[PDB]
Amino acid sequence: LKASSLRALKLMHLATSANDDDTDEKVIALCHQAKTPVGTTDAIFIYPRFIPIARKTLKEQGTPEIRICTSTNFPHGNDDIDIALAETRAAIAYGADSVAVVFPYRALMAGNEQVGFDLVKACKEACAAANVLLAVIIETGELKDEALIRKASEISIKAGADNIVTSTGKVAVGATPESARIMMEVIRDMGVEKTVGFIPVGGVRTAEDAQKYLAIADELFGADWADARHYAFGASASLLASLLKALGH
Numbered sequence: 001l002k003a004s005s006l007r008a009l010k011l012m013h014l015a016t017s018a019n020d021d022d023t024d025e026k027v028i029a030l031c032h033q034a035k036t037p038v039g040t041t042d043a044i045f046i047y048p049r050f051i052p053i054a055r056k057t058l059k060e061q062g063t064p065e066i067r068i069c070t071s072t073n074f075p076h077g078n079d080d081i082d083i084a085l086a087e088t089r090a091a092i093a094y095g096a097d098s099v100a101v102v103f104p105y106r107a108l109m110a111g112n113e114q115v116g117f118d119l120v121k122a123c124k125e126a127c128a129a130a131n132v133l134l135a136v137i138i139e140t141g142e143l144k145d146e147a148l149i150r151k152a153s154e155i156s157i158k159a160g161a162d163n164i165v166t167s168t169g170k171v172a173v174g175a176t177p178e179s180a181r182i183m184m185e186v187i188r189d190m191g192v193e194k195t196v197g198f199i200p201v202g203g204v205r206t207a208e209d210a211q212k213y214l215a216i217a218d219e220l221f222g223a224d225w226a227d228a229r230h231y232a233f234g235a236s237a238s239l240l241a242s243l244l245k246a247l248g249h
């Protein structure tokens with residue numbers, strides 16, 4: 001477990017706990033937390049307008065390698081591609097290393113598969129031209145059905161997603177061991193394990209959970225697959241406190 005909690009800490013994408021009431025001071029506190037006694041988390045997850053100050057802080061503490069992830073079309077997941085695209089172009093210009101666009105899942109739940117494909121594809125073309133990763137949040141907690149979770153995963157992957165994410169963290173249900181396994185099974189069944197990673201958001205509170213979720217990835221792809229590029233824990237500082245507590249900190 002000590003080996004798992006450290007492995008997980010380095011895969012963490014430390015997310016802000018703010019709800020659009022974030023502040024520069026809170027983001028600076030978050031940047032300092034990403035610098036743990038046992039090493040750095042892979043990235044932080046913050047709102048676009050705080051990327052410049054976060055980048056400044058990360059360079060000031062000697063951790064310029066910590067990546068910055070942000071969100072667009074978030075958390076609503078509306079089906080307006082122009083707005084989602086513009087927000088992605090802004091996140092790119094802010095300096096984001098990765099942009100997590102929210103899939104238009106309500107449109108899928110109403111029977112529209114194309115809008116999600118075009119939306120993801122439009123944002124991927126922008127992130128790719130800027131050397132930025134595009135993650136796609138499909139919001140498993142709202143899709144609920146296994147078939148819809150797979151469909152949204154397949155569509156996102158076909159549209160060029162570099163990572164598929166379970167949840168925004170803003171709805172009733174986030175990641176679960178079931179939905180996480182479903183999405184990773186899609187990555188395997190489509191043979192895209194080399195180019196598509198997985199990120200659970202919302203359902204990983206403790207070190208035991210981090211070990212459980214990593215066990216699924218190891219089981220399905222082997223223990224070597226879950227590196228910084230192909231796996232990450234989108235979670236707040238509470239999980240980091242549990243991961244550190246398991247390591248005696």
Ligand SMILES: O=[N+]([O-])c1ccc2nn[nH]c2c1
Nearest residue numbers: 013015045069100135234235
């Ligand atoms: O923690 N998160 O809510 C979250 C969402 C999307 C992401 N993409 N990369 N890291 C992410 C973290």
